[PDB]
Amino acid sequence: TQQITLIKDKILSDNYFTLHNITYDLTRKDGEVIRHKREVYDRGNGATILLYNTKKKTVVLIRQFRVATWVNGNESGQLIESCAGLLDNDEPEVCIRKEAIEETYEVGEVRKLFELYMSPGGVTELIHFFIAEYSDNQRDEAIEVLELPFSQALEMIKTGEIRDGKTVLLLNYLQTSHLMD
Amino acid sequence: QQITLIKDKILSDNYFTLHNITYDLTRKDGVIRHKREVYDRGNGATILLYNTKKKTVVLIRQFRVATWVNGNESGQLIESCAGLLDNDEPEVCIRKEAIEETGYEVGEVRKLFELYMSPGGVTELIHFFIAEYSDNQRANAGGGVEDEAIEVLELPFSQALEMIKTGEIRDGKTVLLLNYLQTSHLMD
Ligand SMILES: [Cl-]
Ligand SMILES: [Cl-]
Ligand SMILES: [Mg+2]
Ligand SMILES: [Mg+2]
Ligand SMILES: [Mg+2]
């Protein structure tokens, strides 16, 4: 796999985000040279934050219409997710504190977990994952604020009611962390 | 409540399809127009292989040009075995992908969930599986087929877990599987 030589980068779409067709030569371990041609969709990077309450034993999530989901088996298009946004010229922590105010709370301490490529087959997207405590100290649209029992959130992963990658990632992390114990 | 598709413009269509979708969303009050790009690459399946005797997992590593252009210096990415459904049912797809990529003929598998991975503008839903493997189930060396160039990694499960902390594993579905396995006590 070793040797990579970029050959061409053709822009297929420059509408708003960018779709590329990238051609590169890849030398396999047997020494054979294969030319790959691969579509790469660049819609930028993102941050997401699970909000939790240790005293109430609750999490706060958001529900909104996701058109990409609506065209692919999600009947209503509505999706339950952790608060998230695009890193829009902002550092991850700056982006996410701002998204926490807008979507849901002006949180205090956040904890960063990891930064993960969510769909590396054909999408550049890297997501910065955070958790943070919320209270009624730190306090009507298409974006519905959901406050639910953590035990309920876990159950909705089992039934399929919560079926978003980053959200399940975050809820599983909280489960194992002991912050809700 | 109500969603109405207004226009679906095809921005690109070679194998996969990029859309620009205009739709009208109705609120509680009762209409707002939105326009969003939607990238349709199809759905896929992924599997984490584990060995309770050896306490090992099997993962793969291959060049991902999409990570290369965005922070991943070498472009090499450690992931769980995965592929696109390409009109097979998820379990059919995944046993096929597992023997091609890892060399293992898997026995019984466990379905975990099916998750949208990047729902901001990608349709992709991934079917998640795990399966126990045995050394006597290795039929070949794996490595993929056609133009695939895949390195097969068998490693201590405790080692793959700490690679999540060090960033040596930085793939969403793979961390999801590894964390699911840890919570399961199957490797205890
Ligand atoms: Cl209506
Ligand atoms: Cl089990
Ligand atoms: Mg958002
Ligand atoms: Mg694959
Ligand atoms: Mg494959």
Inter-chain residue contact B123 with A72, CB threshold 8 Å: yes
What is the C-alpha to C-alpha distance for residues A154 and A35, in angstroms, rounded to an integer?
Answer: 44
Q: How far is the CA of B174 from the centre of ligand 2 (A)?
A: 18
Inter-chain residue contact A169 with B147, CB threshold 8 Å: no
Q: Which residue among A26, A120, A125 places its CB closest to the CB of B77?
A: A120
Q: Which residue has the tokens 């114990």?
A: A181
What is the C-alpha to C-alpha distance for residues A107 and A153, in angstroms, rounded to an integer?
Answer: 21
Inter-chain residue contact A124 with B66, CB threshold 8 Å: yes
What is the C-alpha to C-alpha distance for residues B26 and A49, in angstroms, rounded to an integer?
Answer: 27
Tell which B residues from 124 to 183 touch A, by Cβ distance under 8 Å: 124-126, 147, 149-151, 164-165, 167, 170-173, 175-176, 179-180, 182-183
Per-residue CA distances from A65 to A82, A127, A170, B124, B180 (Å): 14, 20, 20, 16, 28
- Name residue A118's amino acid: M
List CB contacts (< 8 A) between A45 and chain B.
70
CATH number, residue A177: 3.90.79.10
Resolution of this entry, Å: 2.0
Centre a 10 Å sphere on the Cβ of residue A110 and count the other Cβ atoms it contains: 17
The method of structure determination was X-ray
Inter-chain residue contact A125 with B118, CB threshold 8 Å: yes
Identify the domain containing residue A34 by its residue range.
1-181
Contacts of A84 (CB under 8 A, 6+ apart): A46, A47, A48, A49, A62, A99, A103, A127, A166, B120
Query: Could you give the angle at which helices A165-177 and B172-184 cross, rounded to 10 degrees?
Result: 40
The total number of structural domains in chain B stands at 1
CA angle, B102 then B53 then B185, to 5°: 95
What is the C-alpha to C-alpha distance for residues A71 and B40, in angstroms, rounded to an integer?
Answer: 9
